[PDB]
Ligand binder design. Structure first.
Ligand SMILES: Nc1ncnc2c1ncn2[C@@H]1O[C@H](COP(=O)(O)O)[C@@H](O)[C@H]1O
Ligand SMILES: Nc1ncnc2c1ncn2[C@@H]1O[C@H](COP(=O)(O)O)[C@@H](O)[C@H]1O
Lengths: 258, 258
């Protein structure tokens, strides 16, 4: 499958930016763009051979892990750390069968009982996104936790917390130029801070925003979506135009109108 | 005032296109653009010295006339043909006073009792836009009619009909890239044909389209505007996005939101 490499060791805003441009470039075919926003491939009819891309992450401690991203939604589906592969609970037969094509060469393959969505992951992590730190240092740490899961070195709460950081720093930054900007600021000043309300509200409404845009009357939404600003003030979106510098990829919801 | 020259003698699609790009360039300051469409200057606070531009038209018969265009709406306000100037009925004191600054050097100045809007002009012309021919040949003819008005050569129905052709080939083509395209086709094939429904419906709703766009919720219209296709099928516009390749200039209706 395509593999993209990124190391947290000595990451700068440009090597991180290059990494996220490369992931978006693998996720998209260029075939489907609606109101200037690329739509991800539709899962019905996609061949297994084009279903996943892999992301190989390395850290300052010279440890690596490879995450498998699903190309229809850019979400992390499972991962490899040396001799073992772990996959989240497939929530349908089609996906149960698809993940058998990943990391076939690994000896021990495990499937967790829990899925990879945020709520399960926050329950298991014993903590919410609002309290978990994101930045180059948290991702550095996450690479190690994930890698030492193999050998009893990581307990399930640190595993879940490391999954939340990976998914927001890779999958969500690819879904949104806005969240990628948020991560670049953290790297520029080498800060680590929990996500503010605008980040979490964007992440929660990615699927609904994709549908509202694709079902729109020429860009006009039938019902408005309320998002939040950094300080928590709510605001309504009525049109795709203001989301164009904010969302970078949409999940396929319907075919483009005539 | 700025003056732009155009001759119907040997007009091609590029000399006509150059002429309409020059008129739009004089009408607009570049200061106010909303959803990629330029807004014309607001009449409250505009100095008289920047209120009009002049368009000097010549034809194959080596006759000229100069029309005065109002810069707040690109409409024809009056005209000069040699020793005489004629102005439409000013419909307010502010405009009565403004037109005194035009063609001051002419000996005979007249103000018609009728205004220049389409209905009055169709009544006087004894004919509707749907039946009047537009093209390089009708504009050629209009230049002569307008010029011979001075000397009893043109009767008021031909005067009104010549005003309808000038206003659609200059003011409306500047208001709309669409109507300018319509006129370029006529010149390319040297055809003359009356305007179809999409043209007349655009002309009739220029003012309402300007307000709907400037009062929009981020591009989304509160109420849709029904326009017509060439064959007369009605269709609704819900968003400014589809009007962007169609309208080139908007009349000022309100100040741009924060
Ligand atoms: N495999 C996954 N990895 C990370 N986040 C996910 C995954 N699947 C879903 N999500 C996100 O978690 C939340 C709930 O997911 P879901 O239960 O499929 O709607 C939504 O914000 C999803 O975008
Ligand atoms: N001076 C003018 N010359 C040509 N058309 C005009 C002029 N003033 C208004 N119109 C158009 O004629 C119609 C009626 O004008 P009004 O009576 O001002 O709304 C509308 O389509 C206007 O855009």
């Amino acid at each position: 499958y395509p593999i993209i490499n990124f190391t947290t060791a000595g990451a700068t805003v440009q090597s991180y930016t290059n990494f996220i441009r490369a992931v978006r470039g693998r996720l998209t075919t260029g075939a489907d763009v609606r109101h200037e926003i690329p739509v991800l491939p539709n899962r019905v009819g996609l061949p297994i051979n084009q279903r996943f891309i892999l992301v190989e992450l390395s850290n300052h401690a010279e440890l690596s892990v490879t995450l498998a991203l699903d190309v229809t939604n850019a979400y992390v589906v499972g991962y490899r750390a040396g001799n073992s592969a772990y996959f989240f609970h497939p929530d349908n037969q089609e996906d149960a069968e698809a993940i058998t094509h990943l990391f076939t060469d690994v000896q021990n393959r495990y499937t967790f009982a829990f899925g990879g969505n945020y709520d399960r992951l926050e329950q298991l992590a014993g903590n919410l996104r609002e309290n978990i730190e994101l930045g180059n240092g948290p991702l550095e740490e996450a690479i190690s936790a994930l890698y030492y899961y193999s050998t009893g070195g990581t307990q399930l709460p640190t595993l879940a917390r490391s999954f939340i950081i990976c998914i927001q720093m890779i999958s969500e930054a690819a879904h949104f130029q806005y969240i990628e900007g948020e991560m670049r600021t953290r790297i520029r000043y080498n800060r680590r801070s929990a996500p503010d309300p605008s980040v979490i509200t964007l992440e929660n409404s990615w699927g609904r925003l994709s549908t509202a845009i694709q079902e729109s009357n020429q860009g006009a939404f039938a019902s408005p979506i309320q998002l939040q600003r950094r300080n928590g003030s709510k605001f309504s979106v009525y049109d795709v135009s203001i989301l164009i510098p904010i969302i970078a990829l949409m999940v396929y919801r319907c075919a483009p109108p005539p």
